[model samples]
Each structure stands twice: as C-alpha cells, then as structure tokens.
Target: MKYLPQQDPQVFAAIEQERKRQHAKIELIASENFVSRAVMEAQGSVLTNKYAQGYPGRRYYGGCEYVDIVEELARERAKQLFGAEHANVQPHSGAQANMAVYFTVLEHGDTVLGMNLSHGGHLTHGSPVNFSGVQYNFVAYGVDPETHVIDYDDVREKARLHRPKLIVAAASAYPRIIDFAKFREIADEVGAYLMVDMAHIAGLVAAGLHPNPVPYAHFVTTTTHKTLRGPRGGMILCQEQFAKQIDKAIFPGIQGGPLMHVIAAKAVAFGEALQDDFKAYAKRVVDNAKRLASALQNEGFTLVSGGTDNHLLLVDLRPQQLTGKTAEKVLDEVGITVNKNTIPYDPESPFVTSGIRIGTAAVTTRGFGLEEMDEIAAIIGLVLKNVGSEQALEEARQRVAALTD
Candidate 1:
C-alpha cells in the first residue's frame, strides 16, 4: 500500500476509497465476503511474477519450483478440505471451472440438464446468453411454484426425457439443502455425469454444515471466495479417474497459466477452513441468515422459500409493492448492499425483477450476529415500507450508519 500510494496516486486513491466504502457499508450481497489478512497478503505476494502453466512437478516453464510448491499446497489443502480424490486449482473462476468440466465430459451440442437461470441457478448453469447454453444443448429444471424449492421429481422428469450427457446440481441463490445424493441417483438412472457446483456452499460443506458433494459428483466446482473467504479463484474436485482430463480441460482447453499468488492465498484459506473457528463461523452464518429471514417474514415480507437453511435469502418485493431494482437502489442509499434477483416464476423482466437477494455472509464476517441481523431486518422494513418518505429513509440510513460505524 505504501509503495502503491507513493508510486501511483490515482490507483491508490481508488483502492483507498474502495476500502472506505467496504467499511462504511453493510454488505448483504450473497456472493461477497471479506477475506482474512493472510489471504490478502498472499494475494499481494511476489508469486504473481511467475508463469507456471502446468500442474505441480510438471510445469511447462522453467524456474517454476516455488510456484509449484504453492500450487501443490493449494491442491492438497483443497482435496483434504473437500475429501476429494483429486483437486484442480488452476481454473480462474467458477464459470471456467464449469466450462472445463463440460469440455472434459461433453462434446459440442450435447444435451445437458441444469437448474433454470430464473430460479436459483447461476448464469453458467444454462442461461441462453451464456456459453453453456449456446455451445451445448441445455435443458433447464426449476423449483416448484408453491414451495419455491427444487422439485426432485421434476428434475428427474427432465433428466429422463432429455437424457442429458451431464446433470448439474447447484444454485447461486438456493436457501435449502440441495440433496446431492438424490441428484446422483437421478443421474445414475439417466446415465448422466453429475457435476455439483458447490461454489456458494463450499465453506458450509467444508465445515460439515452442509452435505459434501465430492462423493456423489463426478466433478465438483467451486469458487474460493463467497462463503469460503478465500482469494478470488475457482477449483475443481473430481474422482481420480477424471483428474487428468479435468486438469487438461482447465489448462490448454480453457485457461492458460494459473495465478500463483491467488493459489497461495487459496492455500491459506483452505488451511483456515480446516480449523474449528471456521466451522463455528459457518454455523453462525446460517444462524444469522435464518434469523434475518424470520425477521423479514415477521415484518410481512415474503421469502422465496418461506425461510432459509443457509446464508442467503430471496425476498419477494411484491408484498411491499416495490420492484427489486428500486429496493436495491433505496437500500444502497442507506449503505446496505444487495442485488436485484429473479425469484422463482418471477412475473417481471430480468432487469425489473420482483426480489432482492440478501445474505449474512459478509456482515457475519464483520462479526454480526442475530441481533444485528434483526436490526438489519428492521431497517429494511422501515425503509421499504416508507420508500416515499425521505425523513423515514433518513432515519433508516442513520441507524445503518450507526451500526456500520
């Protein structure tokens, strides 16, 4: 920071401003979290200067000894954390990881079954605009209308009818257990490969708070951040039989060289995730999420699933007569960061959705508990209930400022 500040004032100023913004706001964004200082330090290390294009002990470039060590630690730690037969830590992001998996097992135009984008699924799952949907034939399965949760029977129906080459079991906004084993059974029945994108639930799975997908899935992909609190990167966990294919798919097939500094940071994070403290932290994340969901419901806001069993919730804004876009903007004015999301069977367009997706992951990382969650709920209720009243909005803003400060 000192060097950057002295050498480049413009970039340093923006970086400092970002720091200020992060500290000033109450972050409720579902996919965001504050990494530990150890992670940041590793990410800022000199390992970024390397050009290690291949796995440990088998590099495509010379002078890769040190970077190999870092990569090996990251791989080993990831495998241990997830109880996987093998791990590939070179994917630059979750989308790339998933793309690599697809390359390994599927040919172009092969039919794949995934969660619907309008429901809780990520864009890479099968959205028409994404590569997954364009390059390959993708069939989408979604949650039930009444329960707003994935219907296993419906998923099975899609799998049986489509007979997809791969079945994806994952979500970006789902709030309950995914039933990976059940997905595995359906995949088996349909003779499909099961790939579980456990990006959002990585930390929970590592802490045993959620079911581990490594055993049930042929390939498991996850981002190192989100609930994992690592540097921004992606990983792939698969059985030993597919490890070599997965690795090649990630390297020459998708990405080139890996980020050594980020890999080191991921190693630090994986080490941290192995401790009892991370488990307790993961537990509190769910606790706060459930409490906040309950508080929001009690305030007359309807949750997508009626409640949550994880670290995020989808709040239907129709009850408050607000669109997700307006609620996001209004909440941002009060220093609360959240995203406008498409709920199950949403009646509005993607840009003007009827729900705001919120989570306790970042705030819990900032040491928030159930009381803070309740307070956040109250602020949300007050602000949304009086969107036209500047005075009421000001009051809510002050309360949020007080809490964050």
Candidate 2:
C-alpha cells in the first residue's frame, strides 16, 4: 500500500477501484467471501520471496526454517479443523488440489464417476473442456429431476454399470447436505476409491452443521475461501497412509514450488476457523440462505430444490419468463452480483441458463442478517420483474446503495 501508489500507479488505481466496488455492491456469488485483515497481511508479507519446493523440514531449497514452521502450523491447523489424519497445504487453488488427488490415485484414462455438472458439479469433476475429462474416462450421475437432490439409486446403478476406479462426491451448486456415507457405501460396493470435493461446504462441515466427509472419504479436497473464509488457495485431506503419495503428487507430479505467503495466510484462516466466532458466522450463513430462499419463493420465484439447507440456492427464472443471462444483467445494473447457473434438468444451454446461483456467505460476512435477506429477495423480485422500466431500475439501485451504505 505504501510503495505501490508511487511505484505502479495504474495497478494501484485498479486495485483501489476494485476495493471500492467490493464495498459498494452486494456480492451474492456462491464461491466468494471476504478474508480477514490478518489473512491479507500474511499473504502480503515477505514470505513470498522464498521458494520451498517440498514439505516441512524437507525442502528443496535452503533457508526454509521459518517457512517450514508456517506451513507446519497450517497443516496442523487444517487437520484440527477438519478431523483428518493428514493435510496437504501446498495447492494453489481448489482445482489444483483436485488435480493432485487425481494424480495420486488414478491412472490416465481410468474411469471415474462424478456428479453431473449441470446438476451442481464443478468443472474438475469432468467438464469436457477441462483436463480431467480430457485425460480420463469420466461418467456422470445426476440428481433426481423432481426433488433436485442426489439420487442414490441412480448413483448405485451408475457405479455398478461403469465400475469406475474413482467415485467423486460433493458439488459446487448443490443446496442440501450430501450423504457421504451413502457415497462411501456405493464406492465400497464397487471396490472404488471415494474422493469428495467439499469445496463449497467446507466451512459448514467445520462448524458441524454439515456432515464431515473426511471420515468416509479416501480423499477430500476444498478451497480455503468459500465458507472457511480463508485465503484464496486449496488444501487436501486424506488418511495417513496416503500422506507421502499425496505430497509427492502435489510436488513433482503436478506443481512446482509452493506459494509460501499464501500458505501462511491459509494458516491464519485455519486458526480463525478454529475459534468459536467462526461457528456462529457459519450458522448465520445457513440461516440467511434459508431466509432468502423463503423470501424469494414468496415473491413468486421458483427455487431449484424448493428450498435450501445450506448457504446457496438456485432461483429458476423460467416462471418469470427470463433467461439467467437477462436476470444477471438486470441484477448487475442494480448493484447485486450473481452468476447465471443451470438448474436441474434445465432446458436452456449453460451460457443462457434458466437460473441464477445466489449465496449468503459474502453478505453474512458483511453482517447482513434475516431482515437484509428479505430485502434482497424483494429487490431481486422488483428488478427482474420490471427489467424494462428505467425508473424501477433506478429505484432498485438506490435501495442497493442504502443497503451497502
């Protein structure tokens, strides 16, 4: 902050604008959250100058004593938070964490079963454009069309038919608690390894609000940011037996030197999540989500699952006679940020879907509660229903300003 203003004014100006934008708008993106100042400070520290290519106490470079301590703290704290036997804190992002896990246990072109992308799965699970799909044979299991929940019967059928080497559980856009036990059972029946990408629900799981997949899964991957409210990085948790392979996979197999500064920030975040207040914050996140879902339903908006048991919900815009693309644009005009997403069994394409994904994590971090959730739902209803009216859009903008102010 001190030197950047003078040394790189253009980049500093852009960063300043981004900071202002974050403060001025309502962030509803499901995968986004604001990190604590301590986390930011740790990330901005001089640790970035170091290059520790390996695990703690066994670095590829010398002078890793201090960074080793930081990484050890991060690993231990992550284990404590997730109740895992081992933790890898080196991944740069959630995608990389997933990639490391795949590298550890799977062979190239091996068959894997993951949740369907349109049904809430992430790209790493098996989108055709991603490396995961390109290198491996990926099959999909989808949620039930009527209930919009994972169909256990369908999953079992897929596992029995495909007999994949790996079965992936968890989702990016799902709004209910995943039954990890059932997934484990299916994996066991198929003699498969179970990998859970608990990126979206990591915070909820840490708070004991959602089921902990670490107990049932052979490998678990998550981002530190989402609900954990940590830095923008990834981590892997597995049993002690696979610790060495996991570490090797992350280092020599996939990535090079770790981001030591980001690892330090992850340590700060894990420490914060170990505290009592983080649990309270997690509770508010789910509560605010449920309140928003109910309020949206009252405004004649159709929700994907008819409700939510987590921090996010998908509003089906078909009943409103609008595409997700149109709704996203209208909401952005009103200073509310959300992403167009496909609902279960969507008739439209991914680029112009039938729904928008909204989450309460970021707003709850900003201290918005049940009343604010109600107001947000009402504002969304007003904006989307009257998208053609300039006066209505202006009024919604003022309401957003008042809320942010």
Candidate 3:
C-alpha cells in the first residue's frame, strides 16, 4: 500500500475508491465472493515474476523449483478438495478452463450439448459469440417451462437426437442442485464425454453441501473465486488417464505461462476450504439464500423456481411490472449491487431481462445472517415498489447503510 501511493497516485486512488465502494454496497451477484486476507496476500506476493510454463517437476524454464512446489501444492490441494485424480491449476480464467477442456477432448465442428444460456448457462457453455459455439455445433437443453428446472427428459432427447461428443452440466445462475448422475447417464447412453463446469458451486461441492461431479464427470472446471472465495483464476480436474492431455491443452495449446502467484493464492484458499469452519460458512450461505428467497416472496416478488436450493435465486419481475434493468438501477441507487438476468423463457431480451439475480455468498461472508437477509429483502421491496418516491429511496439508502456499516 505504501509503495503504490507514492509510485502511482492515479491507480491507487481508483483502487481506494473501489475498496470504499465494495464496503458501501451490498454485493448480491451470485458469482461473486470475498476472498480471505491470506488469499489476497498470496496473490500479491513476488511469485508473479516467475515463468512457470509447465506442470510441477516438468517445467519449460529453469529456476522453477520454488514455483513448482507452489504449483504442486495448488494441484494437490485441488485434487484433495474435489476428490479428483488430477488437477490442472494453470487456466487464467473459467472460460480458459472450459476452453482447455474442449481443446483436449473435441475436434472443431464436433457436436456438443449444453444447458441453454438463458436458462442459467455461461457464455463459454455455448453462446454464439463465444469460441465454444463458433467451433462446435452446440445444441441446447432448457429447463421445463413450468418448473424452471433442467428438463432431464429434454436433455436425454437432445443427446439422442444430436449424438454430441460432449455434454456439459452445471450453470451460473441456477439455484438448484444439478443431478450430475443423470447427466452422466445420458452422456454414457449417447457415448459422449461428460464435463461439468462447477464454477459457481465449487465451494458448495467442496463443503459437501452439493453433489461432487468428480465421480461422474470426465472433466470438471471451476473458478478459484465465486463461492470458492479464492483469487481470480481457473482450474480443471480430471481422471488420471487424461491428466497429461489436459495439462498439454492448457499450456502448449491455449496458454504459455501460468500465474504462479494466483496458483499460490489458490493453494491458500483450498487450504482454507479444507477446514471445518468453511463447511459452516457454506451452510450459512445456503441458509441465508433460502431465508432471503422466502422474505422476497413474502414481499410479493416471484422467484423463478418458487424458491432456491442453493446460494442464488432469480426474481422474476413481471409480476411487479418491472424490467430487470429498472430493478437493477433502482437497487444500485440504494447502495445494493445486483445484476439483471434472464429468467427461464424470459419475454424480455438479455440486455433488459425480466429478472434480477440475487445471491447471499458475499454478505454471508461479511457475517450477515438470517435477520440481515430479511432486512435486505425489505429494503429491496421498498426500493423496487416505490421507485418514484425520493423518501422511500432515501429510507432504503439509510437502511442499507445500517446493514453495511
């Protein structure tokens, strides 16, 4: 901090402002979480100067002895955390992790089946603008219209019809437990490689709150952030048989050098996740989500699935005659941060969707519990329902301050 202020006042000032903003606002984005001080310290270490272009014990450069140990710790911790045979900690981001998986297992123009983007899937899953969609003939499986849960029957039908080379499981905005076993069953039936992008729910899986996909998936990719509460990076876990291929895909295929400092941070975070307290913290995350969902429903907001089974829920705003854009803006005005998101079969476009996604991870990390969740829902109701009233907005702002401060 001392060096930064004197060395670059302009960048330091923006960082300071962002730090203040993070403290002042209630972060409800489902894919976000606050990392521990240890994680931050590790990421800010001197290891960033290294050029560790390969896996542990097998480096493309010399003087990699120390970084090799760090990377090995990250890989070992990740394997232990996820119960996997091998772990690749080199991917720079979740998208790169997914891309590496595809690069390892798929040929260009191969058929792949994934969850629909509008139904909680990520861009790397198969969005047209992303590399996955452009290179592969990606088919989509959607959630049921009425239940807003993945239609396993639809997944089966798509697999049968398309005969895809791979079937992707898990989602970004989904709030329920995904049945990885069923996805695996379908993948086997169609002779496809099963991959689970457990990026959003990796911590839950680590805490044993959610089903571990390692047992069924050929490859599992996740972000080090999100509910995992680590540095911003990506990791891929796979069976031992494919470890070398996965590593090669990440290094010689998609990237050159690995981020050793981030890998150090990942190792620290994985160490934290292994502790018993992380289980309790993850439990509180889910509990807070359920409490917040019930409170929001009581406020007359329609949740996408009537409720949530995990740490996030989608508030379908059509019942209140509001667009996600308006709700997001109004909520932000009152010092709450959330993202506009598309609900299942949304009538509005992705840019101005019919729903906003809310999550309890960050606030729960900040030690906010059930009572705080109730108050947050109440404030959201006040801000959304009375968007035109300055008095209501002012009151909501003060209430938000009360919670954050």
Candidate 4:
C-alpha cells in the first residue's frame, strides 16, 4: 500500500493505516489521549530489557541498577507532581492499582462504598460484575435523577448505613470537580479509608486546572495513559501513614516486573506536566468541554448534571430521538470517536445506553480549539437531529475527516 513502505509490509501496513486513522480523526473520548513523542520514545526504549520485580534498592533479580534509577525517578516525579507523600509506579493498569489498594487495606468481603458504574463510575469502583463486588461487600451510590448529578447527601446516608471499610471518591464519566474533603469527612465519620481514583483527571489535576484529591484521599489511584498523556500504565499515591502497606501491596500482591520503560515515560510525562505552559493546556481542556456541552444543550439535547465543570459530560439521547449506540455509530462514521455512556436515569440496557459521554481532553490534545469544537458539536447535532439518516451521516463523515489538518 502507498501508506506502508516498510520492509515488513503486512504488519506495517495495518500499523500505518491505524496511525492514519488516529491522526486524521477527532478523539473526544474522556479516557484517551495522545502521548508526547518523548514519552513514546521512552516507552519504546531499551529499559524494557530489564526485569525489575521489586522496589528500587531492593530487587529479587540482578542487572536492575539502572532500571532502579529509572523507576525511582518516575516515583519522585509522581510525588513532585501530585504533592504526594508516596507513589508506586509499578501497576500495569488502574485495575491492578486498585487491586493493590484492596490488598493493602481491606480484608476479603469487607464493606466498601463507591459510585455505581452505570452512573459514571469505573468497574473497579464496586460494580456488581467486577472483582470489587465479587471479592468484597460492595455497595454503590449514584447520581441524582432530577439533577443527574452526584448526590453526596445520598453518599453520606449510604456511609452512615453501610459503615463501609473503604469509601472511594471517583468517576470515569462524571463532569464535575470532586470535593475531596467532603469524601474525607464521610470516610472519617465511619472510620473508613478514602481512596480517590483520579485516573480520568490526572493531567488536569496535576496542572491545577482541576481540584486535586490527593491531599484528602488517604490513597489515590490513576492510569498514566488517559489524561496524564503518558504510557499505558498505572500508579498509586498515598498518605505517609500508609506508605509501607502501599509499597508492599504493589510489590508482592498485585504486579511484578514493573515496566521500566513505561515508568521512564511516566517520568517524562510528569516532567512535562510540571511545566508552566501545561496549565494553559489544561484550562483549554475545560473551556473546550464547556463549549461543546453548551453546543449540545443549545441543540435541544438533554445534558446530564446540566453542564460540565470538567472535561466530560453525558448527553442523554432520549430528548433528541436516538439511542446512544446509534449515535456512537454515526459519530464513528463521521471520524469522531466517543463511547456510549449511561445517562443518570437510564431506561435502557447499558450495551445500548441512552446517553453519550463527551469529552475534550483528547481533541484538545489533537489541537482542537473552540472553532473545531463548534464544528464537532454541529456534526453531533446533525446525527441526533437526523437519526437513522445513514446517507446524510456518510456525507458528514467525509466532511469531518476533510475538516481536519
């Protein structure tokens, strides 16, 4: 193919085609981003040659001296970035990170409280189908129906009733700033540990565009790839009191042979995140989110929680006469990537949800400003307004790709 000129045509062809797809599209998914070239270089570095199974200064294998320095730098960078007392950069992913937290703190079947997945939470946050529910006594709180917003008052009520061992303040699709201290108060009232999963907002939080939860959360978990603009990896940040347990949990409990390459990339990401200009980028992320959400609302769609205060918001499709799945298909055909999400008061199955979760982090990373955002919003509006108009959707699809650089 013209796009694939490498020696190995078969595999390189597919890779090149996929690269083209990513490069020429809108990536508005909340949990996605484009990593920097330096981060990618580190991820594809020779440090992957090492197999460092334990923390720095103490390893089960040899030839890890330099990789130790790599991991330590990643750890120190994470601490510096988050104002965290301790950090574990060895988690393979966020679920693994949460597993480590569970191992460090809770006994099997202990009561734990987190948001419901169908209501904007992740699977690790006590969903009935996930390990959180199967392994522990997992209870869930959810967003309000009338307002389609997190009912913290309801969360406090659940806390009083469950007296759960752990309380998590986190979300994957939620669009508002989390109140870390409020969660802390609830956790304290029930003598439970609080862990905030800031996986979706790590970059913004580190850049100070979003309120940080690390100071109030007894422990915090995050994936590096999502908003952090790093390699596909995970980390844990915790209070000094729980530092040892956190370290031991990640070391012997969940994962081994931490990806030194990814840790190095995370170091680079943290370094980039700590720069002065990153704040401007983070601000633009939120501004783009507000603009997109406003565009949706103006088109007569129902936006959950009224609007967004962060980089994501859910658009309930019922008001606009389409299912979330169909809307997803239309947007995908139009070169705009987004995921079908659950609206607060969903009346349909999760697989074909009644809502679409919108975000700006990825598109902003792709160099989209307010003007591009307005164009994207208009396309989405067209799909909803002309639901099932496959011909019209195809016409818009070609134009969307052509609209990009």
Q: Provide the clashing-pair count of each candidate structure.
A: 0, 0, 0, 0
> Per-residue CA lDDT of candidate 3, range 281-395, in tens?
9999999999999999999999998899899999999988999999999998999999999999999999999999999999999999999999999999999999899999999
Tens-place lDDT per residue, model 4, 271-388, is 8888887778888888999999898787787788889998898898887768889888878877888899988768989999998988888888877888877788888888778867
**Would you estimate the TM-scores of all the predictions?**
0.99, 0.99, 0.99, 0.96
Q: Report lDDT (CA) for all predictions.
A: 0.93, 0.96, 0.95, 0.86
Model 1, 1-405: lDDT tens digits are 679989999999999999999999999999999999999999999998998998888889999888888888998999889999899998899989999999999999999999988998888988889999899999999899999889999999999999999999999989988999999999999999999999999999999989999989999999999999898989999999998899999988899998899999999999999999999999999999999999999888999989998889999998778899999999988888999998999999989999999988899999999999999999999999998899988999899988987
Candidate 2, residues 1-405, lDDT tens digits: the string is: 899999999999999999999999999999999999999999999999999998899988899999999999999999999999999999999999999999998999999999999999999999899999998899999999999999999999999999999999989899999999999999999999999999999999999999999999999999999999999989999999999999999999899999999999999999999999999999999999999999999999999989999999999999889999999999999999999999999999999999999999999999999999999999998999999999999999999999999
State which candidate has the highest lDDT: 2
Which residue pairs show backbone clashes in model 2? Answer: none
- Best-to-worst ranking by lDDT: 2, 3, 1, 4
Winner on TM-score between 1 and 4 is 1
Which residue pairs show backbone clashes in model 1? none
Off by over 4 Å in 4: 1-8
Candidate 4 lowest-lDDT run of ten: 1-10
Residue 218 alpha-carbon offset, candidate 1, angstroms: 0.3
